[PDB]
Design a binder for this molecule. Structure first.
Ligand SMILES: *[C@@H]1O[C@H](CO)[C@@H](O[C@@H]2O[C@H](CO)[C@@H](O)[C@H](O)[C@H]2NC(C)=O)[C@H](O)[C@H]1NC(C)=O
Ligand SMILES: *[C@@H]1O[C@H](CO)[C@@H](O[C@@H]2O[C@H](CO)[C@@H](O)[C@H](O)[C@H]2NC(C)=O)[C@H](O)[C@H]1NC(C)=O
Ligand SMILES: *[C@@H]1O[C@H](CO)[C@@H](O[C@@H]2O[C@H](CO)[C@@H](O)[C@H](O)[C@H]2NC(C)=O)[C@H](O)[C@H]1NC(C)=O
Ligand SMILES: *[C@@H]1O[C@H](CO)[C@@H](O[C@@H]2O[C@H](CO)[C@@H](O)[C@H](O)[C@H]2NC(C)=O)[C@H](O)[C@H]1NC(C)=O
Ligand SMILES: *[C@@H]1O[C@H](CO)[C@@H](O[C@@H]2O[C@H](CO)[C@@H](O)[C@H](O)[C@H]2NC(C)=O)[C@H](O)[C@H]1NC(C)=O
Ligand SMILES: *[C@@H]1O[C@H](CO)[C@@H](O[C@@H]2O[C@H](CO)[C@@H](O)[C@H](O)[C@H]2NC(C)=O)[C@H](O)[C@H]1NC(C)=O
Ligand SMILES: *[C@@H]1O[C@H](CO)[C@@H](O)[C@H](O)[C@H]1NC(C)=O
Ligand SMILES: *[C@@H]1O[C@H](CO)[C@@H](O)[C@H](O)[C@H]1NC(C)=O
Ligand SMILES: *[C@@H]1O[C@H](CO)[C@@H](O)[C@H](O)[C@H]1NC(C)=O
Ligand SMILES: [Zn+2]
Lengths: 679, 72, 136, 68
């Protein structure tokens, strides 16, 4: 609270000065610099709600944040060992090659946490839509799309509804490259999990390398094109020359001077946390760049001697060089032009510093070293597992949230639309069916912690637009992925004319100061992965490219049921609500208990939660399969469920007043009965 | 009804032909496996049975569908 | 009073007694009453409790078979049962509301076990309705 | 020693027996809270111990008969 008594001193100063800014309306201001600062100060936020609606919303946000960080999952065989998500449940989803263990961790995380978040999130959406309409927006998704809006700067305007059309326009061009990466990964996953993956269907959701399939980067050890050739790594040449965590920050400082950007600030070189203390002096090690004010720029990271800590130093120093450039701006106009520019400048620095052309001139990577064209395919496919593999996931999730906020998806169809959009856009299928008691998107961090997600899509597109424009100014000759912008002062001038602006000008104008266009474009991303797109089309000659949205991991052990209520009864006929589906799941669990007792002499305690129902229709039809009582990986085979239903079919018919033609099972036909009447 | 998932009392005799085209405009390639019949009266009234079949294979079939079958 | 009686119970005044006569309703063609039939009975009571709270009180309460607590099981085939809230063991549903839920779905519980209202009795719930006004 | 019991309304707060579940049974005057702690301790722990103990008794009777 030495900083909370200073932070609340700052959070209260803003709301005092925000009400004073209401005295000057915006229809009379002619100067655009003083107009842009007033828009940032006049916005009400959650101060427009009621006094007890603003505290109900803050209680839901704290509850959803606490269930995520403290919710745990324990083992069926040993209920005393419970695992949290952030250690332990992530290392199963990143390292295990066991189909049954990955399916347990995927499904049991969605259960408890899933449901809680369900009602929480419902309330959340409701409350969030009221705050945005009182601020003259359509919904809360239109509130989030207002970061990209430019109003009346005479040929640089940008609507809030135009962002939805430009995201879907650029996504239809990434779709041929993503289908060949999808079809290559599916063929390599069929050698790791045989008899689990169809050669023409979607990919199972629990086999993707992490908990949600956000990145496919942990699938590299299974999908590497040339496994006997190692990747370029210089973590051992840094120790042979004894590089400490001060030389690697002086090498990053020389990279920015070579393109024309300035040095550090003496104050910076003075204060900084460029190494870990190690003793009982504690602290956070996350790598962060700081902009404390009045010319104070500091970096805090536990710096080891590794190749990626050499690359993170180039990434974080790009944040400092971006903050150092708009330091002549007013205080409210000191940020990136939108939310995506700030993390895109930092990633083109680590992109150009990791090339073998750069490393052989820095002192590492011995000067007689010609790189093969088989390590360039190994390099590009590792990049596409992180860059290209995340773009259908990012587009689908914001499309689902944009439609939930505007009401195009009703509340009884949230989970039905979620898995229809995953089978169609992403090519990923669920391994078990999920009803409207689940809230599977809210099990991600950014959804339950109230963060916008479209910034990870636009940052990926700006990153290769900046790199292609800066490699044309530096006169690069070969492919784009071998480019290096160092020792080129005319490329560091195109970057600095965007860096020095901040939010002073529209973001459509800050693009034109670098790339020569006003909109985001996906052709520089496709030119980066062009040597990989040629190689993927030759590896997919005999394979099938694309997916069918009908195959399912549980589809070949399901049984279809068809119920004809108004033919068996006509009138005197009841209505089929969710209480009748509960009685149906209990009669199947009764029929499974009786078959295992009288045929196999085992006592297995089947419940109604072991009968998994999918594809419910008005005609009254669904599929079902039966699992072991607390083992979701153990599906009972269909030929044994057919024998259990035959033993108790007359008992299930009497429970619903149907008679064997109005309750059919589609593959189980009645057989017996001789009509030998007369003696 | 067994191919397009519609309620029970859905698509009676009054609404056969208009519900034929609502399905094929909803989704093609699911109507192509459907086998329909061209059955109509004046084709069920017009069999040429005569001489013994009007009592042993025509009249005695209509008796079984009446209320009191072994009395008529 | 000094001493105790071993018959009083904290759950005894909200219990309902059930009596099942299998060999009178069927005779032969009669099944055997194992623990799988008690599981189906606890599911039909939980079904009947879900329907009553939906059509009379418009609440959705997810009763399960674990909320139907069975005591005093005998060979004649009799037991007591009471119903609690789904995950609150302190909240016993009152007996006069369980009697109304069983009356609404008594014909549906009878068909699930092939009994007919005299071989499945509830001892305090008696059938009432039905005028025999036959001739016009 | 390591089996714990958590709350119906908040499943993230789980109590062990030796701190926390003993102080409810020693200090609370609430009928509903004492009935929750009494019954939910017997459930999980109860059942596990069930089969464990069955096996236990069986094995223990063999050691004693071989010692006459
Ligand atoms: C918009 O208003 C700002 C003042 O808030 C103007 O900025 C001043 O510009 C003059 C000359 O350009 C400088 O001498 C001042 O030092 C500036 N003020 C500050 C605080 O730096 C700005 O010029 C105005 N814009 C237009 C187009 O007139
Ligand atoms: C921000 O919220 C206020 C609500 O307090 C909005 O309403 C104005 O409130 C002030 C008092 O602080 C009144 O003097 C104004 O007359 C109110 N305006 C209207 C139109 O009623 C205010 O408009 C909001 N500002 C923005 C930019 O949305
Ligand atoms: C940028 O250019 C400078 C000079 O053009 C390079 O420095 C030379 O590096 C080579 C080998 O790395 C040495 O043999 C020369 O003696 C260096 N010249 C001077 C003046 O020191 C520098 O390596 C280039 N950087 C990159 C990344 O290519
Ligand atoms: C890397 O380059 C080499 C040489 O250009 C390629 O090897 C040749 O590929 C052609 C195409 O099928 C064959 O006809 C030749 O026989 C290959 N040469 C040898 C010596 O085997 C190689 O295909 C390239 N690899 C990639 C991944 O692009
Ligand atoms: C859950 O069911 C699966 C069966 O799908 C069990 O997996 C088997 O595990 C044994 C040894 O653990 C292997 O020898 C079998 O090959 C596995 N079966 C298959 C189909 O791969 C799993 O053990 C069960 N889990 C529990 C806790 O009982
Ligand atoms: C479980 O049910 C009991 C009812 O038996 C609830 O106890 C009531 O609690 C409220 C406030 O907590 C009191 O005002 C009532 O007087 C209590 N009822 C009785 C009969 O004493 C209890 O709250 C329920 N628990 C949960 C978690 O819902
Ligand atoms: C950056 O600092 C170094 C001293 O460490 C100095 O020699 C160099 O000239 C500076 N760069 C520029 C552009 O002045
Ligand atoms: C048949 O289904 C349609 C679709 O909702 C409905 O409008 C119509 O009323 C149904 N017909 C009958 C007889 O229920
Ligand atoms: C659907 O099938 C019928 C039957 O052949 C056909 O007449 C009709 O044109 C089809 N609908 C369309 C849109 O082609
Ligand atoms: Zn960062």
């Amino acid at each position: 609270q030495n900083m909370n008594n200073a932070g609340d001193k700052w959070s209260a100063f803003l709301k005092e000065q925000s009400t004073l800014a209401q005295m000057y309306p915006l229809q009379e201001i002619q100067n655009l610099t003083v107009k842009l600062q007033l828009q940032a100060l006049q916005q009400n936020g959650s101060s427009v709600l009621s006094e007890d609606k603003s505290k109900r919303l803050n209680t839901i946000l704290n509850t959803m944040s606490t269930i995520y960080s403290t919710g745990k999952v324990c083992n069926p065989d040993n209920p005393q060992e419970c695992l949290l998500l952030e250690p332990g449940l992530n290392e199963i989803m990143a390292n295990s090659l066991d189909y049954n263990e990955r399916l347990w961790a995927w499904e049991s995380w969605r259960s408890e946490v899933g449901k809680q978040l369900r009602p929480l999130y419902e309330e959340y959406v409701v409350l969030k839509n009221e705050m945005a309409r009182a601020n003259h927006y359509e919904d809360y998704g239109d509130y989030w799309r207002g970061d990209y809006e430019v109003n009346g700067v005479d040929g640089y305007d940008y609507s809030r509804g135009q962002l939805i059309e430009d995201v879907e326009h650029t996504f239809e061009e990434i779709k041929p490259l993503y289908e060949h990466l999808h079809a290559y990964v599916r063929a390599k996953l069929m050698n790791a999990y045989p008899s689990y993956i169809s050669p023409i269907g979607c990919l199972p959701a629990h086999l993707l390398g992490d908990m949600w399939g956000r990145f496919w980067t942990n699938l590299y050890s299974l999908t590497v094109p040339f496994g006997q050739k190692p990747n370029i790594d210089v973590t051992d040449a840094m120790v042979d020359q004894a590089w400490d965590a001060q030389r690697i920050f002086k090498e990053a400082e020389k990279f920015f001077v070579s393109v024309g950007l300035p040095n550090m600030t003496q104050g910076f070189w003075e204060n900084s946390m460029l190494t870990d203390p190690g003793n009982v002096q504690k602290a956070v090690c996350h790598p962060t760049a700081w902009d404390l004010g009045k010319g104070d720029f500091r970096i805090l990271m536990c710096t080891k001697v590794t190749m990626d800590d050499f690359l993170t130093a180039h990434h974080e120093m790009g944040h400092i060089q971006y903050d150092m450039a708009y330091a002549a701006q007013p205080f409210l106009l000191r940020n990136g032009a939108n939310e995506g520019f700030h993390e895109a400048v930092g990633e083109i620095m680590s992109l150009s510093a990791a090339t073998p052309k750069h490393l052989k001139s820095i002192g590492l990577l011995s000067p007689d070293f010609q790189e093969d064209n088989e390590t360039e395919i190994n390099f590009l496919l590792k990049q596409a597992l992180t860059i290209v593999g995340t773009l259908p996931f990012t587009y689908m999730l914001e499309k689902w949230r944009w439609m939930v906020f505007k009401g195009e998806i009703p509340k009884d169809q949230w989970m039905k639309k979620w898995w229809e959009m995953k089978r169609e856009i992403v090519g990923v299928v669920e391994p078990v069916p999920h009803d409207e008691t689940y809230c599977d998107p809210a099990s991600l961090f950014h959804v339950s912690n109230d963060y916008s997600f479209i910034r990870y899509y636009t940052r990926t597109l700006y990153q290769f637009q900046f790199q292609e424009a800066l490699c044309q100014a530096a006169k690069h000759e070969g492919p784009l992925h071998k480019c290096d912008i160092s020792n080129s002062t005319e490329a560091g001038q195109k970057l600095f004319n965007m860096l020095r602006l901040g939010k002073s000008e529209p973001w459509t104008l800050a693009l034109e100061n670098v790339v020569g266009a006003k909109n985001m474009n996906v052709r520089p991303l496709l030119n980066y992965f062009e040597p990989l797109f040629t190689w993927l089309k030759d590896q997919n000659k005999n394979s099938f490219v694309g997916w069918s949205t009908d195959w399912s991991p549980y589809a070949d052990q399901s049984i279809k049921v068809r119920i004809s209520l108004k033919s068996a009864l006509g009138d005197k006929a009841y209505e089929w609500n969710d209480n009748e589906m509960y009685l149906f799941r209990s009669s199947v669990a009764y029929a499974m208990r009786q078959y295992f007792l009288k045929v196999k002499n085992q006592m297995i305690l089947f419940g109604e939660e072991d009968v998994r129902v999918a594809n419910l229709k008005p005609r009254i039809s669904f599929n079902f399969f039966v699992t072991a009582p607390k083992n979701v990986s153990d599906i009972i085979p269909r030929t044994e469920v057919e024998k259990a239903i035959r033993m108790s079919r007359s008992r299930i018919n009497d429970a619903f007043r149907l008679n064997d033609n109005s309750l059919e099972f589609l593959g189980i036909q009645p057989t017996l009965g001789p009509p030998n009447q007369p003696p | 009804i067994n191919g397009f998932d519609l309620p029970e009392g859905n698509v009676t005799q009054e609404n056969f032909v208009d519900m034929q085209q609502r399905c094929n405009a909803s989704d093609p390639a699911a109507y192509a496996q459907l086998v329909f019949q061209t059955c109509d009266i004046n084709a069920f009234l017009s069999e040429a049975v005569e001489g013994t079949g009007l009592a042993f294979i025509v009249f005695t079939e209509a008796i079984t569908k009446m209320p009191l079958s072994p009395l008529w």
